[PDB]
Assembly symmetry: C2
Homo-oligomer: 178 residues x 2
């Protein structure tokens, strides 16, 4: 039997509650801000999933402020420590174009890759802004910082985008070979 | 109205035919080998999609060996040169775990990240093998090489995995701070 796509939000919700109670507004806000950037939700799915997790006994609410139950804390813990295989490569449509580059002239290839580069540099600039905002905190960064998780997400994103930009630069130099 | 998920294979099929005729066996083989690694197909979808593209006049066959029509070549061209926005970040379940790292002890965090590192180093080794196979060709690599597209896919993958490994190493050193 088919499963509900909204179940993808489960660990994102349980994890959001790991440090204490949040309102539904607080949860939705985390999705619309930091989490939505790497773990997006369809706004329509968040409350339905919250309800499922409540009904399953993973979360409780009072007056609503939601919190993890002992069961929910265990559910989050077991997922965190589980070793999964690494997932299959995510489809990158630009890379499919790159695979078929023989269908483009040198100039068309240069134009395609230049467009991709400018866009990714602009995205990098945005990530750099988010990273500077986080690092504007007083507490220096370390494993023990309450913001370490957020630091992990942002540094991962920054390194990914920097690496993409560097690869594009290298390919543009090949397209523009001496 | 909902669209057919198999349509995701369209440009992969048209592009595979850009250099001349292929059998259905040849196409399926490309999916099961080099393409399937970054542009996977459900084996069940390839022939149905080939049929749709034939019926739409993008591809023709003779006796079957498939080839692009003028329409198909234009369809591929227009897609290649189109500038699209960069897509949203693909969900990386490990990174959601990283975001919630405050729920793990230092040792549990180290164990989680070590597992991910060993797995990604092993994947890197596999990509390195594929890259050496490609580079075992006589023709040196350049924009004009018929294998340039394949080189682009493999180098992109290698750089991505190397960057992931480097980031994991950095985080493990933070978890194991002096």
């Amino acid at each position: 039997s088919a499963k509900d796509p909204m179940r993808v939000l489960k660990y994102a919700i349980l994890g959001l509650l790991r440090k204490g109670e949040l309102s539904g507004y607080d949860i939705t806000s985390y999705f619309k801000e930091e989490l939505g950037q790497f773990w997006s939700a369809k706004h329509s799915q968040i409350y339905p999933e919250l309800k499922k997790l409540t009904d399953e006994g993973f979360i409780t609410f009072r007056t609503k402020m939601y919190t993890l139950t002992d069961s929910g804390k265990q559910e989050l813990h077991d997922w965190l420590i589980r070793h999964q295989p690494i997932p299959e490569t995510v489809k990158d449509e630009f890379m499919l174009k790159a695979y078929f580059i023989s269908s483009l002239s040198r100039q068309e290839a240069s134009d395609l890759f230049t467009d991709q580069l400018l866009k990714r540099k602009a995205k990098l600039s945005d990530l750099q802004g988010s990273y500077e905002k986080l690092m504007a905190s007083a507490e220096p960064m370390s494993f023990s910082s309450p913001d370490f998780g957020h630091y992990l997400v942002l540094t991962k994103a920054l390194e990914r985008e920097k690496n993409y930009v560097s690869w594009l630069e290298s390919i543009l130099a090949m397209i523009d070979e001496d």
